Ligand binder design. Structure first.
Ligand SMILES: N[C@@H](CCC(=O)N[C@@H](CS)C(=O)NCC(=O)O)C(=O)O
Ligand SMILES: N[C@@H](CCC(=O)N[C@@H](CS)C(=O)NCC(=O)O)C(=O)O
Lengths: 204, 203
């Protein structure tokens, strides 16, 4: 099976799919679509929206998968990253749901002129952003291990690092000297997964 | 003992109420008024509703928060998150399509009856028919008569909740259009007499 990840932004919705495969040691091909070629590639993608993943087997037959975090939960489930008990599965989904609520505040600043972006940025940062960072911080304090859920990598860890990178894109000092548990989660995750540290280091 | 703690009657907790109804699992509804939220807020872990408080035989309490993480945990416990990895992907796919449509609906909420009208006319000419077409195509790919296969999943219950929100915005919006969505609802209510009874009684 040849796996191609089709997307437009480098650290958008497809990052959860790339990090789940990286952590699993699963190889894939990146295919980035420019704004310029989207009008003619759109009708070719089932449902007309990115990211999408095209899986071509040895005989050339193609399977398509859409909806970014439904693709990431399927890949994570196949590689034992959706928890190891039903209880662990609830805690993985709990943090995923918390991170996605923070990502939704970040999306409100996107593809806007650089004056309205500034206005929306100062509202969320004094708004729902610190509220949701505190809820995620408390969730991390409840884990029975050093990562988000227990002590082994799950999809919850990778969605969290992706969303925290979006917050620091809005204001790079936002977390300086605050939310130690978030900071610590990142150090712990990169130590549990050499592949992800290599991926991230290298992406930087 | 399971208590579902919430404020709106057909808001985020509906996914949790319908998973329990479909599973034949009894629970208690505890609706919080706008007037009592200031003092009950500090008592709920995370400070946000809906929440589910589970009190066992000896009085010990477990809390669960984040609506669709509670609903996928109950659905998983009752065979409603698909029967193969492939069905689970398709369950999650439709869930993610429905939540994108619910996000358009949330943009109209708790607004003065003026700008609510303004936001309604933009989404209904916007992302709302785009996402209803994508859901309609997803239902046509199912290997059975419901959203995923032929037995109830969480994907079916999130879809009826979100479709009820669209008709709240414009009651004629699906009249004479999207036959697969209409058909899905008829099929689901015949597959789960408990849910037909719940909705009927709710109505
Ligand atoms: N909830 C879906 C959202 C897919 C989506 O909204 N994609 C947008 C950008 S990430 C898109 O393709 N826009 C272009 C178009 O559809 O013409 C997911 O997470 O995959
Ligand atoms: N993503 C969370 C959202 C929880 C949330 O946003 N709750 C809102 C209303 S549904 C709330 O409790 N607002 C009141 C407050 O926290 O003071 C879920 O689906 O459970």
């Amino acid at each position: 099976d040849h796996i191609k990840v089709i997307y437009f932004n480098g650290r958008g919705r497809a990052e959860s799919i790339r990090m789940t495969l990286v952590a699993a040691g699963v190889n894939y091909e990146d295919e980035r679509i420019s704004f310029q070629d989207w009008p003619k590639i759109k009708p070719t993608i089932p449902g007309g929206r990115l990211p999408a993943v095209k899986i071509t087997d040895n005989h050339g037959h193609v399977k398509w998968m859409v909806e970014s975090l439904a693709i990431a939960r399927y890949m994570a489930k196949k590689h034992h990253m959706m928890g190891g008990t039903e209880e662990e599965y609830y805690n993985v989904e709990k943090l995923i749901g918390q991170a996605e609520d923070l990502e939704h505040e970040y999306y409100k600043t996107l593809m806007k002129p650089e004056e309205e972006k500034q206005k929306i940025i100062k509202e969320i940062l004094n708004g729902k952003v610190p509220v949701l960072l505190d809820i995620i911080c408390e969730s991390l304090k409840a884990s029975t291990g050093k990562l988000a859920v227990g002590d082994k990598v799950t999809l919850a860890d990778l969605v969290l690092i992706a969303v925290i990178d979006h917050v620091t894109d809005l204001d790079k000092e936002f977390l300086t000297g605050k939310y130690p548990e978030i900071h610590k989660h990142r150090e712990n995750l990169l130590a549990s997964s050499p592949r992800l540290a290599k991926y991230l280091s290298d992406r930087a």
